[PDB]
Design an enzyme around this catalytic site. Structure first.
Site, PDB file in Angstrom:
ATOM      1  N   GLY A  22       0.963  -1.220   0.107  1.00  0.00           N
ATOM      2  CA  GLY A  22       0.117  -0.031  -0.043  1.00  0.00           C
ATOM      3  C   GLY A  22       0.934   1.183  -0.190  1.00  0.00           C
ATOM      4  O   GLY A  22       0.786   2.080  -0.912  1.00  0.00           O
TER       5      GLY A  22
ATOM      6  N   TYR B 165       9.656   4.139   2.263  1.00  0.00           N
ATOM      7  CA  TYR B 165      10.425   3.030   2.457  1.00  0.00           C
ATOM      8  C   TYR B 165      11.942   3.384   1.905  1.00  0.00           C
ATOM      9  O   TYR B 165      12.842   2.372   2.075  1.00  0.00           O
ATOM     10  CB  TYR B 165      10.097   1.668   1.894  1.00  0.00           C
ATOM     11  CG  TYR B 165       8.631   1.107   2.529  1.00  0.00           C
ATOM     12  CD1 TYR B 165       8.571   0.333   3.666  1.00  0.00           C
ATOM     13  CD2 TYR B 165       7.675   1.093   1.679  1.00  0.00           C
ATOM     14  CE1 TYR B 165       7.518  -0.074   4.237  1.00  0.00           C
ATOM     15  CE2 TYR B 165       6.282   0.531   2.179  1.00  0.00           C
ATOM     16  CZ  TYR B 165       6.148   0.146   3.301  1.00  0.00           C
ATOM     17  OH  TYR B 165       5.049  -0.546   3.824  1.00  0.00           O
TER      18      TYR B 165
ATOM     19  N   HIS C 255       9.203   5.291   7.217  1.00  0.00           N
ATOM     20  CA  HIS C 255       9.036   3.846   7.643  1.00  0.00           C
ATOM     21  C   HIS C 255      10.492   2.971   7.729  1.00  0.00           C
ATOM     22  O   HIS C 255      10.852   1.844   8.272  1.00  0.00           O
ATOM     23  CB  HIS C 255       8.256   2.704   6.313  1.00  0.00           C
ATOM     24  CG  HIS C 255       6.897   3.002   6.618  1.00  0.00           C
ATOM     25  ND1 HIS C 255       6.219   3.353   7.705  1.00  0.00           N
ATOM     26  CD2 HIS C 255       5.843   2.793   5.505  1.00  0.00           C
ATOM     27  CE1 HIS C 255       5.040   3.198   7.390  1.00  0.00           C
ATOM     28  NE2 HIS C 255       4.624   3.032   6.281  1.00  0.00           N
TER      29      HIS C 255
END
Ligand SMILES: Cc1cc2nc3c(=O)[nH]c(=O)nc-3n(C[C@H](O)[C@H](O)[C@H](O)COP(=O)(O)OP(=O)(O)OC[C@H]3O[C@@H](n4cnc5c(N)ncnc54)[C@H](O)[C@@H]3O)c2cc1C
Ligand SMILES: Cc1cc2nc3c(=O)[nH]c(=O)nc-3n(C[C@H](O)[C@H](O)[C@H](O)COP(=O)(O)OP(=O)(O)OC[C@H]3O[C@@H](n4cnc5c(N)ncnc54)[C@H](O)[C@@H]3O)c2cc1C
Ligand SMILES: O=S(=O)(Nc1ccccc1Br)N1CCCC1
Lengths: 270, 270
Positions: B147, B153, B159
């Site tokens: 998602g 990332y 994240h």
């Protein structure tokens, strides 16, 4: 206060279940209220499906689990096992995850537990993540038992740093929902450990629980270091990136910034 | 050449199911033989238990799954559903894992597949781990849909580095069993992607499969840099330890040695 103990083990004869008994006993002796989630004992189904939603689905022809389960959560149409768990999570201050390390993560029956229980909005939203998450008044701790020795999991060990293996769990699953992660209880070599050392491990765990609530949590980058919007890509702030160019270490395991990880970032506090 | 595609998604309408179909089509057209492991379609049971062992147990009063599951395998007393899966692994040259990223790892139903299927001595031994492992002549690849966006990332993303989330699976589960792990196929933001870009993602994946067997695998620290014995703690050779003390970069992600991780170690080969 009150704590929630989640155990993932099929055998009452195991040290994991013995570690649960000691934790439940020591916390009760300190005035905690202790409620348990023994996933195998509960006959827990760990597989997300359209069956997590009780009644009619809104859009069955293209089932979309995150969107569909949130609506089910807001409307009160989640499956009674999922409901019962979510009640226990809001009720508890401390959450202990007692499990055997399995394939470098949590066991499957506990992995599905997160997936069916940490539902959107209940546990996380993109408007309120990490320090801003729904569970920020709660503390959670991993108590892990491994076959391999801590030497295998040291920086020079054949399996590689244990801090990197904990990072998806303590950061992505626990802290993302807002939990303050306490230092994990790492019990290496279980199985090749003598009965006189298992006694001291059970006692040492009870001793730490006497002041578990007073401990420093692990360090994670606070969300204030980031521009939390879809237009900035959730990247670090340019001011924050400037102040880091002259810093020697990284911030965390996941936020190493291509720099040295702070030692035992996922294992040791302060 | 023979391939195995293992899919962990419940809905035939998903982009995940279209990626499995896209992969299976391209491989067949180049002369591969393709067998599938559609876990939700197979109604796969992902829960390790004593019923994984068909007959009588050696030590029923104190059950310990690793020692007994190895014995059932040596005896040929593993649960028949587990055997079917191992036979596919023995038959397969390339293994594709197609799954939606869930809680920063594989879905539970794929987590249990590994736990019931990568049994001791069959998939890994204490005598032959990583480069010497039973699957050392096989290649395996991850195909992941998220998602969240690719920026979240990255090293500066909220994240944290995607390579650190890939390290438990590609090193601990896949490479430990001996697999040469190829570059993962990372499709971020699948839920926010336009129909003509969804097509290009599917077509590019088919194009990479036309010569997948010729790609260089990801870099991992080879086990020969280590003293792989119970007496030295599976730590690095003293000679390797000396020769690294002057290196700026680490070797791998889990083997970062407190140094800078090489860029995209778990994502890009060199
Ligand atoms: C599928 C799978 C994957 C795995 N993956 C990994 C991995 O990636 N990394 C890794 O490091 N390890 C791994 N392991 C090994 C695993 O972590 C160990 O088997 C596990 O941690 C041991 O916990 P246990 O409760 O099963 O031990 P047990 O064997 O039940 O306990 C150890 C001994 O203590 C005894 N005992 C029981 N009760 C008590 C008591 N009250 N007081 C004192 N002694 C007691 C038991 O009888 C036993 O003899 C894996 C195992 C499996 C099955
Ligand atoms: C429990 C849980 C935990 C999660 N945790 C994370 C996490 O930690 N990090 C993260 O990033 N994400 C996470 N997610 C999000 C997850 O990665 C996404 O739900 C998943 O990646 C979406 O893939 P899908 O196949 O469901 O998308 P879908 O919505 O099924 O597919 C996307 C689009 O492609 C379309 N499509 C279908 N067939 C075709 C075709 N032939 N051609 C073109 N288009 C087609 C669909 O109609 C849809 O419009 C999580 C989700 C869940 C349920
Ligand atoms: O010690 S063990 O339970 N640990 C174990 C299991 C799976 C992956 C890694 C490890 Br490490 N095992 C090894 C061979 C005999 C039984």
């Amino acid at each position: 206060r009150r704590a929630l103990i989640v155990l993932a083990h099929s055998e009452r004869t195991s040290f994991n279940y013995a570690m649960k008994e000691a934790a439940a006993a020591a916390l009760k002796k300190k005035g905690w209220e202790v409620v348990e989630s023994d996933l195998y004992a509960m006959n827990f189904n760990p597989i997300i499906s359209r069956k997590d939603i009780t009644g009619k689905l809104k859009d069955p022809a293209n089932f979309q689990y995150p969107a569909e389960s949130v609506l089910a959560y807001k409307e009160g149409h989640l499956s009674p096992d999922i409901v019962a768990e979510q009640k226990k999570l809001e009720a508890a201050d401390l959450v202990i995850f007692q499990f055997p390390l399995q394939w470098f993560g949590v066991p499957a029956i506990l992995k599905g537990w997160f997936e069916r229980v940490f539902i959107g909005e209940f546990a996380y939203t993109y408007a309120a993540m990490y320090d801003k998450g729904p569970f920020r008044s709660k503390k959670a701790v991993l108590s892990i038992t491994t076959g391999g020795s801590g030497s295998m999991y040291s920086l020079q060990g054949i399996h590689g740093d244990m801090n990197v293996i904990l990072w998806p769990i303590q950061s992505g699953i626990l802290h993302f929902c807002g939990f303050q992660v306490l230092e994990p209880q790492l019990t290496y070599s279980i199985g090749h450990t003598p009965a006189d050392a298992r006694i001291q491990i059970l006692e040492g765990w009870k001793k730490r629980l006497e002041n578990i609530w007073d401990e420093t949590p692990l360090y994670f980058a606070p969300s204030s270091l980031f521009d939390l919007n879809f237009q900035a890509g959730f990247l670090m702030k340019k001011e924050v990136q400037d102040e880091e160019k002259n810093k020697k270490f990284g911030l965390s395991v996941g936020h190493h910034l291509g720099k040295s990880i702070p030692t035992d970032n996922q294992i040791k506090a302060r």
